[PDB]
């Protein structure tokens, strides 16, 4: 006899590219024999990310995100075609359109959005003295022009309910955050240091569209981060459009059958390898928000994780200062398993944000 | 070792009835996260209809506790009724005693619960909605006789503070939610709006001055909050027909937690839709609130759930599956059920639905 | 039946009085079983509820006396969701609720699924039926 | 015809004695499983599109749980072809012969 073991199995594979290229094939599978922290089970999801460079003249990229989900017999779907570009080093624009379908209900949307990510400070004493700055506080200002046709009965009902709420309730600007973070989303808001400012609305109106009424909503909101927020603190290089020359794809999914979680993650996208100076590169240091958010669900069952990381490097590139140390080296591919790496994997599955830096050069 | 023993029994009633005998035991040999110990508590609840012609039920709750050799008692009686589908009204009194000090209170309050949306696309596509965001608008009128000099001191200090600072509305939340209650508010999705003190006036009542204070607040929910998302479920006034009793209480010290809760009340089993009954979806706020306090020790769990259906009542879709059966006395133990019990004792939110029907 | 002669966890809803009950009427029903067979609207907005027993001999109405006999644990009332005087879309509500846990090997078992839903009486609201976590009333609402 | 018959998937135990009496040329009655049959997960249904109002399923007087109903053409819902007369009962014990009461 022993304690509640609840083993968790997962493997991770990273294959990088040489030279100035920052691409990387990420491949991850996982299996946890623990009940997922979802109030509706079983859950399924099939996440598709597709990216293609539109025109490098100024930076258009065509990003497509398709989410298909099965949650307690409810078939959920949401697709987003979007044309994102960096109009300025500090300002990002996007013209997009998509649809969401739940069971039989489905409504299309088209949006013209602009996000401005401003860091509170630009002190040189931080840049030249901190070689690897993790936290960097800032604030993103969203400005969204979303147009939703109203061809269903519930679309119309939602529209007049919303306009009545705006006209009558004077607190709609901040009470929208309660509806707008379903369940534990608001709790995860604080975990990453995300503060949602009250939304400010330029107006709701409807006009005769191509085939019917179209609800057009101009609203702005801003969210500021204490340093964990990867959408803020790492804004510039979370969108590698300058170093994108060929189509990028990520295929993810999980099975949430109330007796375990089975995860399948693919990946082909630039930015995986980020330079560290002096010809030395590194895997991009881990995003803070995924770890901190998954800590909100990974601490309910104690588990003996059985992890396996497999990093594959291009010809000539040799790894140095991998902490924790790589278990083995088969010529050019290094492997992590057990010992300190398994402890780090458990640490980050329970929400920890410990540093695991992989540095490599030639 | 730190083994967590617990036996749960659910005995349901059939037909249109939704009642259920719920008795549970817990024996955890771990230190409680109470800054004051030992913390021994006794909780007794009762409710009975007053006049079901318009919904009044007389609900009485007595809390008796001894925390670090400090005998604490709180008795409350209320006459709660659903004035409207979204509005509820109540009136009652009570007393609060700590050691030698004891101040009695009488009150009248109305709680109005709003949902941010009422879309029927969600209703006709989500068979078991769980997360339902909304906002409760408490409107509380409470009168407290001021007999002790300590009552005079509290009242005078409170009125002077309200007159002095303009940030009393938001700084009261620091006082209102003592200790980790404030963190529990945020983790459960709750948000307390700045209270609107509508007037603090004292008048000479029957025997002395009585502090009558109108105030209201609007506490919202991200979907997890039980008081909003299941407003019509937590108060089964329509399906109450006899006195309903719940006797909880824990004996706790520096080296163990012993829990024994009894129960008799409707709403244990709710119709899942189209004649299919189910155990009510687990109230999420107790789970998440035990979340900050159940994660401090790794524990071995041997949890036994003994669900006794009424005669003729079969089961379908038990997840985790029932371990053993005796034709009614379905039993959950070990395997995936003990795993789910550990999950929810450490703060988990994972679903365990029991869809039963004859 | 005596509590000490019955299966341990038996409630008064399933404990039958009239110790020789099973041979007095149908043996399936511990208490007399009535069905809501019609709910029509005539003249004013009030609906006429028709309680026909499972024996099918009478055509009764809720009435204070049968309401008292209900709340005294002597009779039971059901609706038979296939009732044509329904307000909610039971055919879609039954079908999309069986689609959660029924696999159509026959491809028509879910389509032709009909079930009975019990009716209880509170007082402030009349004969009210609790369906899909919501408490409908036969007076208006549910029909 | 009229007086449709139906099956309540709330009393039915799936025994299929109703199906035994349904004419093979009309598969009015069938089976739905939705799970294991050890827990009553084999209820029966009546395909009202195929049912031709035979009375065979109901007039056979074999439904043990009273799931067959035979709603009458107007509104009346039966449960079994004939129902006992709902009698008041008592135990008759004599005074000082045969029995002695006490």
């Amino acid at each position: 006899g022993s304690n509640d073991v609840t083993t968790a199995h997962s493997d991770y594979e990273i294959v990088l590219e040489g030279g100035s290229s920052s691409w990387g094939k990420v491949k991850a599978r996982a299996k946890v024999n623990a009940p997922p922290a979802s109030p509706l089970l079983p859950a399924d999801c099939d996440v598709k990310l597709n990216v293609k460079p539109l025109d490098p003249a100024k930076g258009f990229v065509r990003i497509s995100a398709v989410f298909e989900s099965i949650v307690d017999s409810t078939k959920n779907k949401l697709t987003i075609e979007a044309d994102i570009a960096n109009e300025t080093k500090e300002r990002r624009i996007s013209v997009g359109e998509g649809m969401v379908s739940v069971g039989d209900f489905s409504h299309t949307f088209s949006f013209e959005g602009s996000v401005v990510n401003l860091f509170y400070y630009r002190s040189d004493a931080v840049r030249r003295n901190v070689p690897n700055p993790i936290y960097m506080q800032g604030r993103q200002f969203h400005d969204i022009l979303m147009k939703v046709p109203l061809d269903n009965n519930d679309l119309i009902d939602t529209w007049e309910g919303t306009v009545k709420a705006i006209g009558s309730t004077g607190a709609f600007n901040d009470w929208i955050r309660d509806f707008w973070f379903i369940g534990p989303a608001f709790t995860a808001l604080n975990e990453g240091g995300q503060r949602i400012s009250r939304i400010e609305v330029n107006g709701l109106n409807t006009e005769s569209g191509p085939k019917g009424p179209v609800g057009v909503s101009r609203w702005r909101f801003s969210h500021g981060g204490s340093g964990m927020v990867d959408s803020i603190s790492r804004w510039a290089e979370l969108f590698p459009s300058d170093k994108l020359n060929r189509p990028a794809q990520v295929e993810a999914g999980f099975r949430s059958d109330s007796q375990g979680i089975e995860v399948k993650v693919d990946g082909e996208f630039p930015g995986v390898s980020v330079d560290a100076g002096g010809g030395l590169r590194r895997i991009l240091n881990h995003p803070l928000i995924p770890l901190v958010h998954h800590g909100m669900v990974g601490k309910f069952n104690n588990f003996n994780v059985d992890a396996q990381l497999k990093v594959v490097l291009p010809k000539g590139y040799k790894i140095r200062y991998a902490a924790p140390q790589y278990r083995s080296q088969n010529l050019e591919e290094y492997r992590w398993s057990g010992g300190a790496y398994a402890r780090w994997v458990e640490h980050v599955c329970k929400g920890g944000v410990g540093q695991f830096e992989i540095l490599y050069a030639q | 070792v730190t083994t967590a023993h617990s036996d749960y029994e659910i005995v349901l009633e059939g037909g249109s009835s939704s009642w259920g005998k719920v008795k549970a035991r817990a024996k955890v040999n771990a230190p409680p996260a109470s800054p004051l110990l030992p913390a021994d508590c006794d909780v007794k609840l009762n409710v009975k209809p007053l006049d079901p012609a318009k919904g009044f039920v007389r609900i009485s709750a007595v809390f008796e506790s001894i925390v670090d050799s400090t005998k604490n008692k709180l008795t409350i009686e209320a006459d709660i009724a659903n004035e409207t589908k979204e509005r509820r009204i109540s009136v009652g009194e009570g007393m609060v005693s700590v050691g030698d000090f004891s101040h009695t209170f009488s009150f009248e309050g109305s709680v109005v619960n709003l949902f941010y949306y009422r879309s029927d696309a969600v209703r006709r596509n989500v068979p078991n909605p769980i997360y339902m965001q909304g906002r409760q608008f408490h409107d509380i009128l409470m009168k407290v006789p001021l007999d002790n000099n300590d009552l005079i001191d509290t009242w005078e200090g409170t009125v002077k503070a309200i007159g002095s600072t303009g940030a009393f509305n938001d700084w009261i939340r620091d006082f209102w939610f003592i200790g980790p209650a404030f963190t529990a508010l945020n983790e459960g999705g709750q948000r307390i709006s700045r209270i609107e003190v509508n007037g603090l006036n004292t008048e000479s009542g029957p025997k002395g001055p009585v502090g009558v204070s109108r105030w209201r607040f609007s506490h919202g929910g991200s979907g997890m909050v039980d008081s909003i998302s299941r407003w019509a479920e937590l108060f089964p006034s329509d399906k109450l027909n006899r006195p309903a009793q719940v006797e909880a209480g824990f004996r706790s010290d520096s080296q163990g937690i012993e829990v024994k809760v009894d129960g008799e009340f409707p709403g244990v089993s709710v119709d899942a839709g189209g004649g299919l009954r189910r155990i009510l979806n687990h109230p999420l706020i107790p789970l998440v609130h035990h979340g900050m306090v159940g994660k401090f020790n790794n524990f071995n769990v041997d949890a036994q759930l003994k669900v006794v259906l009424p005669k003729g009542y079969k089961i379908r879709y038990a997840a985790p599956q029932y371990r053993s059966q005796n034709l009614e006395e379905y039993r959950w133990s070990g395997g995936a059920y003990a795993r789910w019990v550990e999950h929810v004792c450490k703060g988990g939110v994972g679903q365990f639905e029991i869809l039963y029907a004859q | 039946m005596q509590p000490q002669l019955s299966r341990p966890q038996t409630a008064s809803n399933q404990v039958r009085k009239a110790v020789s009950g099973p041979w007095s009427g149908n043996a399936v029903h511990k208490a007399e079983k009535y069905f809501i067979t019609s709910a029509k609207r005539d003249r004013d907005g009030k609906l006429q509820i028709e309680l026909v027993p499972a024996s099918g001999r009478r055509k009764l109405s809720p009435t204070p006396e049968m309401i008292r006999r209900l709340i005294d644990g002597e009779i039971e009332i059901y609706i038979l969701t296939t009732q044509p005087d329904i307000a909610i879309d039971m055919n879609k509500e039954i079908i999309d609720m069986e689609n959660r846990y029924v696999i159509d090997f026959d491809k028509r078992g879910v389509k032709w699924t009909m079930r009975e839903i019990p009716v209880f009486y509170h007082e402030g609201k009349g004969l009210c039926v609790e369906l899909h976590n919501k408490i409908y009333t036969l007076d208006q609402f549910f029909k | 015809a009229k007086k449709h018959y139906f099956i309540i998937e709330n009393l039915c135990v799936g025994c299929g004695l109703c199906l035994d009496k349904c004419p093979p040329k009309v598969n009015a009655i069938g089976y739905k499983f939705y799970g294991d049959v050890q827990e009553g997960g084999f209820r029966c249904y009546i395909d009202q599109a195929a049912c031709i109002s035979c009375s065979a399923c109901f007039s056979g007087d074999e439904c043990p749980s009273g799931a067959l109903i035979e709603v009458l053409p107007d509104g009346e819902v039966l449960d079994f072809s004939y129902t006992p007369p709902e009698r008041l009962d008592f135990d008759l014990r004599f005074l000082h012969r045969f029995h002695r009461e006490a």
Binding site: D257, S258 | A318, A336 | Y101 | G35
Partner: peptide, 15 residues
């Protein structure tokens, strides 16, 4: 439909 297969399974937690 993956839920349905788990829904329609006999109790497999026998001793």
């Amino acid at each position: 439909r993956r839920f349905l297969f788990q829904r329609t399974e006999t109790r497999s937690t026998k001793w």
